[PDB]
Amino acid sequence: SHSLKYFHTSVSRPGRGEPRFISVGYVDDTQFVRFDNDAASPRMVPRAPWMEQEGSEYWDRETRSARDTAQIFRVNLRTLRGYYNQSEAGSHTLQWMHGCELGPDRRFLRGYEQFAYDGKDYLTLNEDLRSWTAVDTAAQISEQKSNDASEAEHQRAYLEDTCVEWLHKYLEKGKETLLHLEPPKTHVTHHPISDHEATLRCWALGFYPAEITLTWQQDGEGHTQDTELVETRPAGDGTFQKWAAVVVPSGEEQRYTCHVQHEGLPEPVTLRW
Amino acid sequence: DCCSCQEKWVGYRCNCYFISSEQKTWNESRHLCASQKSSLLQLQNTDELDFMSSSQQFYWIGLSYSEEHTAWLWENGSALSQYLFPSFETFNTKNCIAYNPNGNALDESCEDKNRYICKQQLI
Amino acid sequence: ARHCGHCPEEWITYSNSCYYIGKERRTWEESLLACTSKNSSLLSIDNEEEMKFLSIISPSSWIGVFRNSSHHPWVTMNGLAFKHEIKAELNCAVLQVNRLKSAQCGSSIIYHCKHK
């Protein structure tokens, strides 16, 4: 299973006219292209080593797309500021994301796409990709002006056709990295809080993809509790890190175990200290 | 006549339009339209590019700010209807305008590269 | 309000041939008849450049190309064999953003007419 996700953000700026518009493209959990109409290069650039072999033909077309999307948004922001009867003084945020998921079989599994205005769900593309559904009792306007216009189509077509075919085009281009599974370098540490309690912090380092699990159990078996779990953070080298700790009455440390579930693992590991 | 319209040019309401895909600046497009012996698009009503209303691109039109009359003016000297683009108020007078068959206008830098539309009258 | 003499009133002319930008959504069959009611044929795709034009005017549209069973040859309106490429129970051809695709003959889509 793989995915081609794109994330588009347009923030408006009352002062300096043109709203800022940023696009990032992720294959799986690897970013490869970005566009930033506020940088040294107002065009689409590569963010992955395996894209620096593409030609003008591609970098141009994609800039055509990015720049054109950004104008549509400059409008939209206005268009919306209208609907929501908003202060022309304030600054607001329009977000758009879409992506295609391939089944294990390598072929299209499902597609998604939706808009958001000011951190709130605005418009969503129906599962069946055949129509748009408003969310705010004010996106109803954009609904029937997209169902009518029947944009549902060219969109349903992107996800199933272009997006899928391209995802494959990318997975091939970046074969060596995108596809290689990198299991976590697990290991437990001890951290006394007082004479009575100690923290057992189970680590998971340098892994990819970013989905994982980390679970504590002990003597007895499943669960325990009095646990802390942190958001899976990026290392920066493309891999990730997560840790799960638990507090333990001293001496009992060896009752507890940590169960790491990852896709890079033959089967779940277990740690002790 | 009324059925000339070069080739790769499209005729409508007895006028000869030319939606480009090529992208150039304003002063550039202005001159290109001149060579082809036509004008940078000048809108009557938003129903002029009706046949293209499904478009999402933005094309340079022939609007600019007149230092002289302290007003936005078409290239032909005539003034801009208060209606066409309702926000003309907030266009920066240092920018040129780019239009979209829907009815939407954007004021961008006279330098920025954009698509253009040429028009030939026939009356 | 003067308009061209060779082509119908609100129609547009591009390359020796006249066009009618639909804006109404109809099924392949409905479109077929409509275009005929308007004394013309359904939209045919002459050149791969007439297609870069068409893709600037309207995003998607039915075209005069279909299949009988989910497998016989793709056929133009002239009973002839189609000489371009095109993407289940789909049997009518559409034009979608400068590409030719297979769609559901029962789907409602935009249609354009075209003359010689």
Binding site: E62, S65, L123, S146, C163 | - | -
Partner: peptide, 9 residues
């Protein structure tokens, strides 16, 4: 490659 066309809300 990002969706060709977006949406005019």
């Amino acid at each position: 490659v990002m969706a060709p066309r977006t949406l005019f809300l």
